[PDB]
Amino acid sequence: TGRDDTKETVYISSIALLKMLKHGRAGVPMEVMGLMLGEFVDDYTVNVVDVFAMPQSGTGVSVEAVDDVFQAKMMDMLKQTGRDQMVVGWYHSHPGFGCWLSSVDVNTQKSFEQLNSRAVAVVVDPIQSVKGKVVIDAFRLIDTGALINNLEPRQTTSNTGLLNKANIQALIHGLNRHYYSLNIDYHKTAKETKMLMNLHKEQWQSGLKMYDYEEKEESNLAATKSMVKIAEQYSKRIEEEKELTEEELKTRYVGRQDPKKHLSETADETLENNIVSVLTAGVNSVAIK
Amino acid sequence: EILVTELTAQGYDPALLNILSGLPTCDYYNTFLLNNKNIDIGLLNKSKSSLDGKFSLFHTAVSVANGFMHAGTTDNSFIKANLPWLGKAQNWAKFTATASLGVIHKGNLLEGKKVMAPYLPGSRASSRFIKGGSLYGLGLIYAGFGRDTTDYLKNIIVENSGTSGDEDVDVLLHGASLGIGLAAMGSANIEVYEALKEVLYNDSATSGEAAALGMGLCMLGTGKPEAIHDMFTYSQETQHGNITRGLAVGLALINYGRQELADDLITKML
Amino acid sequence: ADINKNFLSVITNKHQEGLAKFGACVAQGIMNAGGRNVTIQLENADTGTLDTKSVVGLVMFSQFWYWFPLAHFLSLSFTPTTVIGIRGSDQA
């Protein structure tokens, strides 16, 4: 009371996310660990600038697996170049479980919360980022004495009210009722957006890179043949399919598994490719010689 | 504002000038609400039981409906009746409850500074939420005729524009900055611009949002080039999330009714 | 009547999210606002010209998700509708 008293929205930089994933992915299946380095401005805005990993253990993540030597010394490296800030929290990996804090890490978060009470824990799944979507979530403890004092609505004040969930019954209990979740957004400048968007020096010069014509004749041959067979499929569909109740007709006279849609799709697809192939050849012949 | 002074120099009855000030018509709206005050009580009971006071979202939902329901007629009966439910309020939900008062006592300008007095600073220390939201409700009460209310809040701002790191000062300054936007709305006070400009530069954690909005309220549709340029750059300068939203919105306010004059600013922001 | 009744169904229900309940409680209080005496005017029928005050209330209201107190700016758009005949020889 007297502040906003809500968990920071963690803005993970362009560098950081990738670094945590590379760090975690190599160690799969074993659990990984490390610190987030960042800076704390508004009552709920922590921008996480960089990360560094705390070396491996033979018992995986523990409070014990923190080693003050590695942490401070690696900090002193950054100190000399002036890129250190302050520890805003830590990350660790559960690739064998979904996003939620295991029994051990809650007590680890307790110690971290003692030191700095904005300390977050971010669970990374390097094993569900083989999707097009990266699975990542942020948690911060709400104390047990704090639940007794019923201060939990204090932490959801002045938010959009949008929170994240992960699987039901055991995962979700720990989630909402013992720690607090806030979404994660991604921070970038226009200098970094250009760095990612760029590709080769012959990727903006890859439209002159025609292909072998044996391959393009393969393409011409395959399309025409296949469409004869889906056309045959299309003939049977429109013989009947003229009584009442559309869905019934579509079930009876194959109208589901729609050949009408499939046939048009293939034709369009091959049609667009062949206008550019013709355009490529007409350019390269006349332009070079 | 311009017309009355010319009639004063030309010479005219004070009866006309009293109408053109606008006081008579505010009193007549109060009388109309009193006569026709019909409030269905089951809406409040049903909402009260289901939207619990313990949960912040629930309590606020009721508060906003309640103040609208009681707008313009002093109705503190709900407050008396459901005092335990009210006592469940906390952090910014309690600030909302205090600000509900300035809707309820809106109008009634003679008693408008004498009905918030028990909650105004120097008479409350139980929570800083009550001290802050009483100044926000003061601006509501006097909104549109708050030329004297502006003076009160400007003093509170210039005092607390030099420190905003403390908890009490922060919540206190937030309601003052919203209040003076309403109180100086459409007056374009350059004294008010100064005072809120310092809150903005203070880089306050929560009051920078109110400062930006309040400035656009006070400076409505003037489109001064110094103000625009100063505000356009400061959103870049500051890294707080609340302030950057507030300046984006405020630039719209100060360029209200600028059609082709504000065209360039529009292009930059898009 | 149906639309009124729908709001009340949500306010009663305690199986929907608070977000739906938040919007239902407020919407119902907006309908009955001012003790059922006020209405939203955008353009006066006094001259058929836009009101400056109106626009300001509404745009501020739209920001209520981000910060909840801003809801109250909606009161700038509530204006009483009544015909007050006044005897124009003493303003009674």
Running DSSP on this structure, what letter comes out for residue A198? Answer: -
Q: Do A160 and C67 count as a contact with CB atoms less than 8 A apart? A: no
In a 3-state reduction of DSSP, which class is residue A124?
A: strand
Amino acid at A81: T
Phi, psi of A203 (to 5 degrees): -100, -20
Helix then strand then coil, in percent of chain A rounded to 5, is 45, 15, 40
* CA distance readout (Å), C83 to A45, B166, C45: 52, 51, 13
* CA distance readout (Å), A237 to A231, A247, A258, A264, B154: 10, 13, 9, 15, 80
Nearest CA in chain A to B132: A2
Residue C69: half-sphere exposure toward Cβ, Cα within 13 Å: 28
Q: Provide the token pair at B148.
A: 């004297």
Q: Do C66 and A161 count as a contact with CB atoms less than 8 A apart? A: no
Rounded-to-integer distance, Cα A269 and Cα A132, Å:
24
B47 at interface of C, judged by CB pairs closer than 8 A = yes
Rounded-to-integer distance, Cα A287 and Cα B5, Å:
79
End-to-end CA distance of chain C: 39
- CB-count exposure of residue A226 (10 Å: 0-12, 13-18, 19+): middle
Element (H, E) at A238: none
Residues of A in Cβ contact (< 8 Å) with C68: 158
Phi, psi of A122 (to 5 degrees): -115, 125
Residues 6+ apart with CB under 8 A from A277: A210, A216
Buried b (16+ CB within 10 A) or exposed e, A12-39: bbbebbebbbebbbebeeebbbbbbbbe
* CA distance readout (Å), B15 to B20, B172, C89: 9, 40, 11
Helix axis angle, B23-35 to B14-21, nearest 10°: 60
Q: Which of residues 9-68 of C touch A (CB under 8 A)?
A: 17-19, 65-68
Residues of A in Cβ contact (< 8 Å) with C65: 160
Q: Do B65 and C35 count as a contact with CB atoms less than 8 A apart? A: no
Rounded-to-integer distance, Cα A186 and Cα B5, Å:
56
Distance from the B154 Cα atom to the nearest Cα atom in chain A, whole angstroms: 22
Q: Which among A74, A54, A73, A72 has a CA at the least distance from the CA of A62?
A: A54
Phi, psi of B185 (to 5 degrees): -65, 125
DSSP code string of C34-79: HHHTEEE-SB-TTTS-B-HHHHHHHHHHTTTTT-GGGGGGGGGGEE
Distance from the A194 Cα atom to the nearest Cα atom in chain B, whole angstroms: 19
Residues 6+ apart with CB under 8 A from B120: B131, B134, B135, B138
* CA distance readout (Å), B179 to A24, B100, B136, B176, B195: 51, 13, 4, 5, 13
In a 3-state reduction of DSSP, which class is residue A184?
A: strand
Phi, psi of B244 (to 5 degrees): -65, -35
Q: Which of residues 129-188 of A touch C (CB under 8 A)?
A: 158, 160-161
Evaluate whether A98 touches A166 at the Cβ level (below 8 Å): yes
Residues of B in Cβ contact (< 8 Å) with A9: 241
Running DSSP on this structure, what letter comes out for residue A141? Answer: E
Specify the pairing of strand A33-40 against strand A45-52. antiparallel
Q: Which chains touch A (3 or more CB pairs under 8 A)?
A: B, C
Rounded-to-integer distance, Cα A214 and Cα A217, Å:
5
Q: Which of residues 24-43 of B touch C (CB under 8 A)?
A: 24, 28-29, 32-33, 36-40, 43
Rounded-to-integer distance, Cα B247 and Cα B213, Å:
7
Rounded-to-integer distance, Cα B141 and Cα B183, Å:
9
Tokens 């809801």 appear where? Answer: C71
Residues of A in Cβ contact (< 8 Å) with B242: 42
Q: Provide the token pair at B105.
A: 């006592």
Residue B189: half-sphere exposure toward Cβ, Cα within 13 Å: 23
Specify the pairing of strand A45-52 against strand A9-13. parallel
Rounded-to-integer distance, Cα B79 and Cα B67, Å:
11
Amino acid at A168: I
Listed in sequence order, the DSSP H helices in chain A are 14-27, 68-81, 103-115, 144-148, 171-178, 190-197, 213-237, 246-252, 259-288
Rounded-to-integer distance, Cα C84 and Cα B232, Å:
46
Amino acid at A210: M
Rounded-to-integer distance, Cα B211 and Cα B197, Å:
7
Listed in sequence order, the DSSP H helices in chain B are 2-10, 14-21, 23-35, 41-50, 56-69, 77-81, 83-87, 93-104, 128-141, 147-159, 167-183, 190-202, 207-218, 225-237, 241-254, 263-269
Distance from the A188 Cα atom to the nearest Cα atom in chain B, whole angstroms: 13
In a 3-state reduction of DSSP, which class is residue A122?
A: strand
Q: Provide the token pair at B268.
A: 């930059």
Residues 6+ apart with CB under 8 A from A227: A263, A266, A267
- Chain pair A-B, CB pairs under 8 angstroms: 49
SS3 track for B126-150 = CCHHHHHHHHHHHHHHCCCCCHHHH
**Beta bridge partner(s), residue A136:** A124
Angle at B66 between CA B65 and CA B69, to 5 degrees: 90
Resolution (Å units)? 6.3
Phi, psi of B109 (to 5 degrees): -75, -25
Q: Provide the token pair at A27.
A: 């160690």
Helix axis angle, B41-50 to C2-12, nearest 10°: 30
